[PDB]
RNA sequence: GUCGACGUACUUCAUAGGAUCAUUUCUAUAGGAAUCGUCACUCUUUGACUCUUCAAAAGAGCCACUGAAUCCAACUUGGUUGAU
RNA sequence: CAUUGGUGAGCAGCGAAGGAUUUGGUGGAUUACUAGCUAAUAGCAAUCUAUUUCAAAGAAUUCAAACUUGGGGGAAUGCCUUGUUGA
RNA sequence: UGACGGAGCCAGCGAGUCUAACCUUGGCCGAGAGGUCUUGGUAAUCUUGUGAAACUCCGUCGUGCUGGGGAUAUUCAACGAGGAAUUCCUAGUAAGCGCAAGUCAUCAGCUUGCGUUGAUUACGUCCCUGCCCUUUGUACACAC
């Protein structure tokens, strides 16, 4: 499966390069489709070439989730490994516990003497889909890295205002039912890519009367994560704050797993450009 | 897909969500669960049989799952794949436990022992490695690549001594007592070994045809000319009529369909072997057909601890002076089938149960397998059921605690009870109830 | 696109999908003639079973299993070029 | 070069791995004299040069 | 023109290459003899491929093992696996196959990690 | 936050004159040039065949009878008055 | 100090009027052994010819026959089918 | 499970003409700028590749902790493995041990890798605390 997954990556990124290469054909095919729709003349480049028209006879019978999650978006529920950095502190192990309670279908793995190459190999041949790696700074958890496993993308975030369900009070147990999700003003294309990354690690299709909600609210490139349970009363909704609250900032999104760091970057945070603090999702 | 052999129907069809082509399957003992493994997916698909859904997909192999089996006693799944790895899944009962066993080369043909304690794999080195399951250690291997008859094809340019094509076994099966292994592959020798001594019992040539390909190890050098062999010239345009002058063999086709579309001679090969559950035979699915091999005991005098005074004449003298137990065990020690038959029909009905209680413990599988393969065809139905009732009531605790010894002898007894005796009883029960209805009611006008 | 069904299906495409050409594009030989020579000489198996005719068509899944046979002199010489030759497992 | 090392394909066979050889560390031995001359000069050659 | 057989043993990051050739009987690890393998309480882990099958197997071959990497106990485990599978491979190739699989039965009945290392780990529970 | 109208700003779009070739004669023009049963020599291009290198890989396999070649051993001849 | 690298010089040991390596040719096998030829119930084998000719038998409205074509578009002149005109 | 003092021996990551102190005492040259030389003190995870530490082996000692101003050339602070409670954890795992890096966010009061040594105990059960699902078999035989 090493040979097969290597050449499956090779073929997928060949198809990716081919589509961005010949996606001018998609738009001049759309141009002559709309020109046959409303009977208007064809521009000169399309009017003089005989090849694209006699190919349009065939291509006339051609014609949402993205490329890595498309094959099994709503079909198979995810399987998520949650692990810490290495020799973790006790508040980081508590945080990894709380994150595996946050995601259903997530188990927690103990990290120590696990090289991240063969941890990626073990994970993606025992068939998990996601890996969430947590990093601390003297107790305070500072980063998390979400990896989608069939050679998919890794989004690396840094966590900022972390309050933990342990560190509040002995408040009881969590709900662990399949939750609804709330994704607030992820307006740009990077926001939609991160929405897809972040929501394809919950189990698909929660109940309509499921009583547990977990919200990712983008507020100036700072995705505020809160978790809630509720009961819909006669005048409004009464919201109770269960589970950890923090703010994650996306600082990298690359197109391989964790193991290589030779992956083609899709977006990494340009921090010292001149226009650093003017635009969001920069 | 599942087939009910009573109403002749396909009552279930299990598919994966991936549309892959399955190359091996294995069913649970109590047919709750059916698993199947492909040659292009690395998972093992586990469907339930009652609800038709996919129950799970077991992942963990990193090569195509070549062979599966379910242990018929403790219900553990032994899978084996081309990543040189056999792998033991405890599926039922809260565990979900996987145990990998590494092996030397890539496994084809796993078979499980009848009592589920052990599992023997074939490997592409041409070796058969027999593993314990509970303590997953190698209990013993057989080196099986030198006792294989790999022929030379007509079209290949490398000798049979050097051909690497078919020096391994792609299908193996344990004996039903658990002490032998029959095996065969894409070569024309089917070999049966005994596992406790790890030695070759016997090697059979599956075909001596020259119209098939992989038969001769040594091809005739009169056919090799100054341009190619003489059996590679297609003299199919010398044929009388068009329908066999036609060449419809599209080029690189191996193992497709429709033998006319291949251009090459059919190779000789065995795809599956099986030991018979009832009577001392095996069957191998060659290209000529289902070859069926069995031992008959009309020939091959093979006695069992006889002495100087144990003779056919001495057996019939003890029968004429009517010591029936002495005559019967003298017949067993000669182990001549006509003597066992003669004494077995000379014993009378009043002292069937005395003789049957006093047969020694070592001659018990002999009399059980004799009564089995006799009473399938012979017409003394009440006599053979008298003997079976006497033997099972006499020593049926010994059979119960030596199950696998009497597992291919007691299973041919209930090929006699349910297939001739119960059919006869069904006919007379039909006659009884038609008589009762035809004389107990009122057909008046 | 569907005009690939008329433009870009081609005997040279079906031929590029043969086994010596898959061998050459997998770098398992130096050229297509030497790949034909090597599998006429009976070194190349796909999966477990040896393949002997050069016309064999090697699909997308089945080109992850083109290897040499074990005990082949060519497998022996590339392992011993990188002096990783383990004579335990015959090569 | 790291991309090539990952995509190596270890069933690779070029015929010049009958002359070229790899040392114990795994790297390549390049004969620093030539490869148009032979390194060891035979005994008649050494007789004449001496 | 001389018979020689090279095998490899490996544990955690140790590696041990054993060359077996037809010789006088001398067993060497890193140039020093086999009786100087440290840490000297695992010298019998190195010695057990020898004593399992008797020194008359070794009395005509001479093995030499180059060990690199790992720590102390990884090195003695790679040494013993290299010695074991080197002796079995020499007996397959230049001595008879009956003795080869008698040696395989002896080493496998003691422990088959003398012949097959545990290679790919872990498990995602 | 969404489309019209105007204003603005930008992109693209010219084909003529002449010659030659294209009809198993003739591409339409008389302004143009070619109709011959082979004799030899030299030079040049190409392909086989035999051997072969990079550089290997596989041996239609065994046994016998005969013949040849090479390297040692041996004998003979020449050789410190000088072989290689 | 290794060479599990080349080339040489020699011992021990092996060792019956020599030894080693390569190669051309032929023969027997490579499937299970009933003889040669022809105009064949017999001739011949040194020969079939100067009896080798006659008679008899023998001729499907099947007076039907590409089961044989790489794909898209055509087919002037052909060719096929059908109609038709004049004999 | 010590304290000294030698010896043995084992890794894996890491290669941007780049990698890195401070405060002084003075002599001379020079117009000054500054240069050179000399000197003492403080700080120090060394400087780019060789190598580790734990470990193994060998000799010696031998097991009731600590203070400043007073007295001659003893008596007035914290502590000898940490309470109630609470948290986390199932195999190359827990824990020990060092070695490198410092990667546009985070980090140096540290963070992340990298190897080395590597176990005890569960691997069952829903009894407790919980959480979730179903309550027409539907889905086609047979059986229930």
């Amino acid at each position: 499966m090493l040979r097969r997954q290597a050449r499956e990556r090779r073929e997928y990124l060949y198809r990716k390069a081919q589509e961005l290469q010949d996606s001018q054909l998609q738009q001049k095919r759309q141009i002559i489709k709309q020109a046959l729709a409303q009977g208007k003349p064809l521009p000169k480049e399309l009017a003089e070439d005989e090849s694209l028209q006699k190919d349009f006879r065939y291509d006339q019978s051609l014609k949402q989730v993205d490329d890595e999650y498309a094959a099994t978006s709503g079909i198979m529920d995810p399987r998520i490994i949650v692990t810490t950095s290495r020799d973790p502190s006790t508040r980081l192990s508590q945080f990894a516990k709380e994150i595996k309670l946050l995601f259903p279908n997530a188990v927690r793995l103990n990290r120590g003497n696990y090289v991240m190459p063969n941890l990626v190999d073990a994970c993606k041949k025992s068939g998990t889909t996601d890996l969430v790696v947590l990093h601390e700074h003297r107790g305070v958890p500072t980063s998390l890295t979400i990896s989608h496993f069939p050679h998919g993308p890794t989004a690396q975030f840094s966590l900022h205002n972390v309050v933990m369900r342990h560190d509040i009070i002995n408040a009881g147990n969590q709900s662990e039912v399949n939750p609804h999700l709330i994704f607030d003003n992820f307006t740009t294309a990077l926001g939609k890519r991160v929405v897809c990354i972040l929501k394809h690690l919950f189990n698909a299709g929660p109940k309509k009367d499921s009583e547990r909600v977990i919200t990712f609210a983008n507020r100036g490139d700072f995705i505020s994560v809160r978790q809630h349970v509720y009961v819909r009363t006669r005048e409004g909704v009464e919201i109770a704050e269960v589970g950890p609250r923090f703010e994650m900032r996306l600082f990298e999104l690359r197109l391989g797993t964790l193991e290589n760091k030779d992956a083609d970057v899709e977006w990494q945070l340009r921090r010292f450009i001149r226009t650093a603090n003017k635009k969001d999702y920069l | 897909r599942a087939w009910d052999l009573i109403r002749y129907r396909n009552f279930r069809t299990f598919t994966g969500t991936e549309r892959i082509q399955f190359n091996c399957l294995a069913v649970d003992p109590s047919g709750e669960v059916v698993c199947a493994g492909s040659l292009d997916n690395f998972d093992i698909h586990v469907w339930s049989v009652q609800t038709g859904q996919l129950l799970d997909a077991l992942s963990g192999h990193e090569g195509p799952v070549s062979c599966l089996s379910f242990s018929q006693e403790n219900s553990v799944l032994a899978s084996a794949s081309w990543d040189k790895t056999i792998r033991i899944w405890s599926i039922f009962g809260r565990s979900q436990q996987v145990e990998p066993i590494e092996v030397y080369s890539d496994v084809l043909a796993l078979s499980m022992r009848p009592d589920g304690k052990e599992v023997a794999v074939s490997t592409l080195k041409g070796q058969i490695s027999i593993f314990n399951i509970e303590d997953a250690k190698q209990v013993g291997n057989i080196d099986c690549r030198k006792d294989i008859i790999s022929g030379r094809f007509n079209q290949d340019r490398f000798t049979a001594k050097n051909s690497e094509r078919s020096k391994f076994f792609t299908t193996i099966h344990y004996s039903f007592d658990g002490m032998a292994i029959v095996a065969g592959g894409n070569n024309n020798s089917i070999c049966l070994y005994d596992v406790p001594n790890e030695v070759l019992l016997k090697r059979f040539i599956v075909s001596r045809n020259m119209a098939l390909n992989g038969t001769l190890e040594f091809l005739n050098s009169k056919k090799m000319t100054e341009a190619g062999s003489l059996d590679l010239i297609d003299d199919a345009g010398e044929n009388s009529d068009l329908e066999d002058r036609i060449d419809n063999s599209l080029p690189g086709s191996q193992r497709g369909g429709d033998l006319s579309t291949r251009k090459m001679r059919p190779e000789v090969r065995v795809t599956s072997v099986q030991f018979s559950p009832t009577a001392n035979a095996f069957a191998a699915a060659s290209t000529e057909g289902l070859l069926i091999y069995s031992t008959n005991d009309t020939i091959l005098f093979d006695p069992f601890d006889l002495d100087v005074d144990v003779t056919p004449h001495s057996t019939v003298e003890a029968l004429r002076e009517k010591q029936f137990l002495n005559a019967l065990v003298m017949a067993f020690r000669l182990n001549e089938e006509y003597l066992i038959n003669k004494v077995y029909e000379a014993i009378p009905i009043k002292e069937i149960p005395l003789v049957a209680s006093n047969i020694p413990a070592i001659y018990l599988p002999r009399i059980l397998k004799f009564i089995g393969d006799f009473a399938i065809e012979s017409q003394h139905i009440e006599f053979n059921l008298i003997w079976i009732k006497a033997l099972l009531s006499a020593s049926g605790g010994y059979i119960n605690e030596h199950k696998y010894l009497f597992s291919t002898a007691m299973r041919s007894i209930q090929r006699f009870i349910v297939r001739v005796a119960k059919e006869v009883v069904n006919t007379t029960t039909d006659n009884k109830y038609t008589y009762r209805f035809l004389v107990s009611t009122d057909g008046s006008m | 696109k569907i005009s690939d069904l008329e433009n870009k299906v081609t005997v040279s495409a079906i031929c590029r999908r043969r086994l010596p050409v898959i061998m050459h594009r997998l770098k398992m030989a130096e050229t297509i003639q030497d790949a034909v020579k090597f599998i006429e000489q009976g070194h190349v198996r796909v999966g477990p079973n040896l393949i002997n005719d050069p016309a064999y068509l090697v699909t997308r899944n089945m080109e992850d299993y083109v290897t040499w046979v074990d005990n082949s002199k060519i497998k022996k010489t590339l392992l011993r070029y990188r002096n990783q030759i383990d004579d335990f497992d015959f090569s | 070069l790291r991309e090539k090392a990952k995509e190596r394909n270890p069933d690779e066979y070029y015929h010049a791995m009958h002359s070229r050889k790899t040392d114990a560390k795994g790297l390549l031995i390049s004969s620093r004299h030539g490869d148009e001359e032979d390194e060891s000069l035979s005994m008649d050659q050494v007789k004449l040069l001496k | 023109a001389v018979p020689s057989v090279q095998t490899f043993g490996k544990k955690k990051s140790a590696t041990a290459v054993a060359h077996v050739k037809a010789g006088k009987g001398l067993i060497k690890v890193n140039g020093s003899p086999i009786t100087l393998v440290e840490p000297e309480i695992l010298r019998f882990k190195v010695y057990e491929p020898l004593l399992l099958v008797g020194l008359d197997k070794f009395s005509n071959i001479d093995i030499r093992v180059r060990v690199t990497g790992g720590g102390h106990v990884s090195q003695v485990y790679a040494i013993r696996q290299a010695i074991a599978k080197g002796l079995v491979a020499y007996h397959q190739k230049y001595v008879d196959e009956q003795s080869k699989n008698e040696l395989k039965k002896a080493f496998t009945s003691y422990d088959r990690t003398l012949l097959i290392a545990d290679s790919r780990r872990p498990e995602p529970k």
Side-chain angles (χ1 to χ4, degrees):
Chain A
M1 89 182 307
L2 190 140
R3 303 192 46 171
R4 181 190 283 237
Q5 288 203 341
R7 65 98 183 152
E8 264 181 353
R9 194 48 201 192
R10 217 189 70 200
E11 292 183 356
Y12 158 73
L13 57 93
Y14 172 75
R15 284 183 287 170
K16 184 249 295 179
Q18 274 293 138
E19 275 264 19
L20 65 89
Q21 203 242 332
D22 311 329
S23 165
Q24 286 81 244
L25 292 192
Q26 171 64 256
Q27 68 192 33
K28 61 187 47 181
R29 192 152 89 241
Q30 187 83 236
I31 278 178
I32 81 179
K33 182 171 297 176
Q34 86 188 12
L36 266 76
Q38 49 253 12
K40 64 194 294 306
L42 224 60
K44 169 199 167 66
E45 53 172 1
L46 304 177
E48 285 188 20
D49 67 326
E50 320 291 301
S51 90
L52 179 127
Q53 305 178 335
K54 63 189 54 184
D55 282 358
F56 180 72
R57 167 155 77 99
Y58 293 86
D59 293 352
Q60 216 183 359
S61 42
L62 292 156
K63 301 213 309 292
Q64 64 97 37
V65 305
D66 42 357
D67 300 328
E68 285 98 5
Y69 314 96
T72 169
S73 93
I75 303 183
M76 278 167 267
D77 309 315
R79 190 188 291 113
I80 293 144
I81 302 284
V82 177
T83 184
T84 71
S85 49
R86 199 154 170 177
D87 307 359
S89 60
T90 318
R91 275 198 61 221
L92 179 59
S93 67
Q94 287 177 30
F95 199 60
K97 181 78 184 303
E98 289 183 4
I99 291 298
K100 87 160 284 300
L101 301 181
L102 197 72
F103 309 127
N105 285 53
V107 310
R108 193 193 168 271
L109 187 69
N110 264 31
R111 175 83 191 270
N113 281 305
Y114 276 152
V115 190
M116 202 45 103
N118 44 64
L119 189 54
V120 165
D121 273 28
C123 273
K124 81 178 165 196
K125 92 174 63 171
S126 92
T128 182
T129 81
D130 296 322
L131 178 49
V132 179
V133 178
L134 289 159
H135 295 178
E136 77 188 11
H137 164 236
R138 288 185 61 177
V140 178
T142 55
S143 304
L144 70 88
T145 310
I146 286 164
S147 193
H148 187 252
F149 261 121
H151 38 267
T154 64
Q156 314 185 38
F157 307 87
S158 68
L159 312 178
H160 281 287
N161 273 306
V162 177
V163 183
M164 302 182 46
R165 212 210 186 273
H166 286 55
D167 293 9
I168 34 139
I169 207 162
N170 309 51
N173 306 335
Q174 295 184 23
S175 195
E176 275 273 78
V177 77
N178 204 8
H180 299 119
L181 307 178
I182 288 177
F183 285 97
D184 200 63
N185 63 98
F186 286 72
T187 52
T188 47
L190 188 65
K192 308 297 200 35
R193 171 78 138 154
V194 161
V195 155
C196 190
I197 286 186
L198 287 176
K199 81 180 181 184
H200 280 252
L201 44 86
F202 289 83
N203 272 9
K207 288 176 73 71
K208 60 181 177 300
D209 67 84
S210 191
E211 52 248 5
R212 212 266 294 274
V213 83
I214 163 175
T215 97
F216 301 87
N218 181 73
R219 293 299 154 92
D221 205 5
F222 277 109
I223 310 167
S224 307
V225 185
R226 264 74 188 167
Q227 191 187 6
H228 290 305
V229 301
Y230 72 106
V231 50
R232 204 180 267 125
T233 188
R234 267 69 182 195
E235 55 267 10
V237 186
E238 304 318 319
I239 280 293
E241 188 156 8
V242 76
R245 66 171 183 198
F246 36 92
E247 270 85 2
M248 50 175 64
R249 182 180 210 170
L250 179 77
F251 75 98
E252 209 166 5
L253 200 160
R254 41 179 67 206
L255 294 191
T257 48
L258 322 172
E259 48 155 343
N260 44 16
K261 290 302 158 219
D262 265 331
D264 280 290
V265 191
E266 184 165 350
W267 188 85
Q268 53 171 339
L269 171 63
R270 311 302 157 134
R271 173 85 165 187
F272 316 120
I273 54 180
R274 202 192 178 276
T275 323
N277 49 11
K278 291 195 173 51
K279 62 193 311 290
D280 298 335
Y281 270 135
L282 65 95
Chain B
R1 60 183 67 207
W3 305 84
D4 181 25
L5 293 177
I6 294 176
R7 324 292 192 105
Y8 289 162
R9 63 167 54 168
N10 177 14
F11 66 98
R12 272 313 190 281
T13 305
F14 315 106
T15 54
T17 68
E18 289 92 316
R19 313 304 306 134
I20 44 157
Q21 50 193 13
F22 302 117
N23 284 77
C24 39
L25 92 168
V27 199
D28 182 274
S30 65
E32 171 195 0
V33 154
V34 50
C35 304
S38 167
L39 253 54
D40 53 341
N41 210 58
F42 327 124
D43 312 335
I44 297 159
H45 288 77
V46 179
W47 303 273
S48 189
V49 187
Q50 289 302 326
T51 83
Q53 67 204 355
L54 186 132
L55 199 148
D56 218 5
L58 315 171
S59 187
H61 285 279
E62 53 178 359
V65 186
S66 200
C67 206
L68 280 84
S69 179
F70 262 109
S71 87
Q72 284 288 34
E73 313 292 279
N74 44 358
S75 54
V76 79
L77 177 67
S79 80
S81 50
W82 293 357
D83 60 326
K84 319 191 188 57
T85 302
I86 167 175
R87 189 173 283 258
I88 310 297
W89 322 79
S90 294
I91 309 180
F92 306 99
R94 287 158 160 133
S95 43
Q96 309 300 327
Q97 284 272 101
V98 192
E99 164 74 26
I101 317 168
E102 184 77 30
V103 75
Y104 291 89
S105 56
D106 47 351
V107 188
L108 27 94
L110 164 144
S111 156
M112 186 91 73
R113 202 176 202 198
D115 37 330
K117 302 261 164 291
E118 278 159 353
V119 46
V121 293
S122 182
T123 42
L124 200 143
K125 297 265 196 305
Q127 292 205 6
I128 296 181
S129 297
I130 302 164
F131 294 88
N132 181 26
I133 294 176
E134 170 66 61
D135 319 306
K137 63 191 293 287
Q138 182 161 117
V139 163
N141 60 352
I142 318 175
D143 179 62
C144 319
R145 89 167 274 144
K146 284 210 182 322
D147 47 5
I148 267 174
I149 306 302
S150 47
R152 188 183 179 163
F153 279 43
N154 278 279
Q155 71 263 9
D156 54 349
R157 321 219 39 204
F158 47 92
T159 53
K161 186 75 69 72
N162 293 321
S163 148
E164 280 262 337
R165 170 183 275 103
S166 59
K167 284 160 180 55
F168 44 86
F169 288 131
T170 69
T171 169
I172 67 169
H173 191 252
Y174 266 39
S175 176
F176 259 115
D177 59 344
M179 305 301 279
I181 284 184
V182 72
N186 300 353
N187 38 9
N188 82 315
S189 83
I190 41 185
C191 307
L192 88 156
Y193 299 88
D194 52 332
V195 307
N197 308 79
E198 307 166 8
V199 83
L200 181 78
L201 290 189
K202 196 170 173 62
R203 174 186 54 181
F204 316 98
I205 299 302
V206 316
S207 155
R208 297 173 81 252
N209 204 324
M210 291 183 183
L212 300 191
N213 222 346
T215 295
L216 292 84
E217 268 171 300
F218 268 56
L219 265 63
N220 198 350
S221 66
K222 265 170 199 167
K223 291 169 179 43
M224 192 52 153
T225 53
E226 284 283 302
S229 165
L230 269 187
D231 296 335
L232 271 295
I233 292 179
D234 44 347
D235 273 22
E238 301 187 26
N239 280 153
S240 312
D241 43 1
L242 171 61
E243 64 205 344
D244 45 53
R245 268 193 262 112
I246 270 296
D247 165 55
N248 43 5
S249 70
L250 47 96
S253 185
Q254 306 191 0
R255 286 297 108 210
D258 216 343
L259 186 132
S260 90
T261 79
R262 264 199 270 272
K263 192 180 272 317
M264 278 304 160
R265 278 208 203 280
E267 45 188 81
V268 60
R269 56 181 292 159
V270 163
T271 69
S272 200
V273 290
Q274 278 270 321
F275 269 110
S276 178
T278 50
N280 210 64
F282 67 93
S286 169
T287 92
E288 289 280 324
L290 278 286
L291 266 59
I292 290 186
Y293 287 95
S294 51
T295 72
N296 75 316
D297 300 339
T298 312
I299 61 172
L300 205 138
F301 174 65
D302 41 2
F304 182 48
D305 63 278
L306 46 77
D307 219 357
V308 199
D309 43 356
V310 191
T311 323
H313 169 265
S314 158
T315 305
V316 313
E317 277 322 288
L319 197 55
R320 198 253 302 162
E321 317 270 27
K322 46 183 53 63
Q323 291 93 23
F324 292 122
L325 182 72
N326 289 44
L328 188 53
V329 308
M330 275 188 164
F332 284 150
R333 287 159 51 134
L334 259 296
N335 213 345
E336 284 284 351
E337 272 279 341
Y338 72 101
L339 278 190
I340 300 172
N341 191 15
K342 169 185 217 74
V343 182
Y344 170 84
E345 295 187 352
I347 299 155
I349 313 158
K350 327 291 297 170
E351 50 196 354
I352 300 304
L354 176 66
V355 167
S357 178
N358 289 341
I359 283 177
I362 39 179
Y363 306 107
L364 196 82
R366 190 58 191 83
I367 182 63
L368 278 192
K369 79 158 282 302
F370 166 68
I371 281 170
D373 82 313
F374 174 69
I376 293 309
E377 300 140 346
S378 93
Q379 76 257 18
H380 309 133
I381 176 170
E382 199 197 333
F383 196 59
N384 299 140
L385 290 151
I386 274 166
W387 264 107
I388 285 171
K389 165 182 174 79
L391 284 176
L392 295 169
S393 61
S395 82
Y398 180 56
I399 302 174
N400 180 27
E401 75 192 25
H402 288 244
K403 187 166 313 172
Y404 308 103
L405 176 53
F406 318 95
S407 167
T408 176
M410 285 276 299
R411 216 202 275 249
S412 84
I413 272 176
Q414 36 188 349
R415 191 223 180 285
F416 152 75
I417 304 166
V418 305
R419 291 271 324 275
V420 309
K422 208 183 154 53
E423 301 315 318
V424 159
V425 164
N426 288 154
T427 298
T428 79
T429 298
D430 278 27
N431 289 151
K432 165 168 81 162
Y433 290 128
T434 55
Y435 157 78
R436 285 175 178 180
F437 181 66
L438 263 60
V439 307
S440 159
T441 45
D442 172 37
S444 66
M445 44 184 70
Chain C
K1 38 179 163 287
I2 306 183
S3 309
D4 295 2
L5 283 189
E6 217 274 341
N7 294 121
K8 284 163 61 75
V9 75
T10 281
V11 186
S12 308
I14 312 192
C15 286
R16 270 188 293 262
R17 201 32 65 175
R18 268 154 96 93
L19 172 64
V21 196
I22 277 303
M23 205 156 305
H24 170 57
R25 291 201 264 97
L26 261 50
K27 306 256 169 35
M28 209 173 300
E30 281 195 351
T31 166
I32 300 166
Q33 194 183 48
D34 276 327
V36 166
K37 286 185 176 52
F38 284 163
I39 79 185
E40 278 190 6
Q41 284 158 6
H43 284 107
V44 175
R45 55 165 173 86
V46 303
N49 48 8
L50 169 81
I51 303 303
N52 193 40
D53 51 344
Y56 180 67
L57 198 140
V58 187
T59 77
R60 280 209 199 266
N61 307 294
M62 216 51 58
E63 58 157 306
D64 313 323
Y65 305 127
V66 184
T67 319
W68 281 283
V69 298
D70 307 332
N71 289 257
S72 88
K73 270 187 178 171
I74 292 177
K75 191 177 198 46
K76 287 208 203 105
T77 183
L78 57 99
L79 297 172
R80 93 171 73 217
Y81 161 70
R82 303 204 161 243
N83 62 19
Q84 292 170 334
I85 175 158
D86 198 339
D87 272 308
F88 180 51
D89 52 9
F90 287 61
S91 280
Chain D
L1 301 169
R2 282 195 314 271
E3 199 177 341
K4 296 183 171 311
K6 287 176 45 64
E7 302 176 348
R8 189 166 81 83
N9 187 79
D11 294 322
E12 196 178 7
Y13 179 68
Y14 301 76
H15 285 100
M17 69 190 55
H18 289 269
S19 86
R20 193 188 294 205
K21 42 177 54 191
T22 281
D23 50 359
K25 262 87 162 187
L27 310 182
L28 200 76
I29 295 179
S30 292
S31 37
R32 90 190 61 88
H33 306 292
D35 217 39
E36 70 93 5
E37 50 193 316
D38 194 350
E39 291 317 307
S40 295
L41 44 151
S42 84
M43 197 54 73
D44 303 345
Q45 313 185 7
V46 190
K47 272 173 181 164
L48 192 57
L49 304 205
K50 282 182 176 305
Chain E
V2 68
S4 179
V5 161
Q6 152 169 350
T7 56
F8 282 77
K10 288 163 177 42
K11 204 182 169 61
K12 291 162 79 184
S13 80
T15 312
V17 192
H19 294 247
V20 185
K21 79 173 188 61
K24 38 196 294 203
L26 56 92
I27 321 180
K28 286 197 166 314
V29 168
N30 278 112
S32 315
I34 207 181
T35 75
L36 306 182
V37 176
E38 287 303 316
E40 205 267 334
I41 208 160
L42 306 157
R43 201 177 277 171
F44 277 101
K45 292 305 262 195
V46 179
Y47 276 145
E48 64 198 21
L50 281 74
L51 309 177
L52 261 163
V53 301
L55 307 168
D56 53 297
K57 302 296 187 316
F58 294 79
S59 71
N60 300 130
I61 80 178
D62 52 341
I63 314 171
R64 52 169 189 88
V65 174
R66 297 290 324 180
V67 204
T68 298
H72 293 142
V73 318
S74 304
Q75 272 197 352
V76 300
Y77 272 64
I79 282 160
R80 58 192 291 273
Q81 175 174 345
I83 291 290
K85 71 164 78 170
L87 170 68
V88 176
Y90 186 77
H91 274 245
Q92 156 198 331
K93 212 170 169 198
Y94 298 106
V95 197
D96 43 2
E97 270 202 343
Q98 181 63 45
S99 50
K100 177 252 289 182
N101 48 18
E102 275 169 23
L103 294 175
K104 270 198 91 157
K105 177 180 173 50
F107 293 146
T108 317
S109 280
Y110 194 55
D111 45 350
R112 84 193 292 250
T113 181
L114 273 177
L115 298 157
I116 284 182
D118 42 354
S119 54
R120 218 275 305 171
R121 311 196 184 199
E123 61 95 30
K125 71 181 180 89

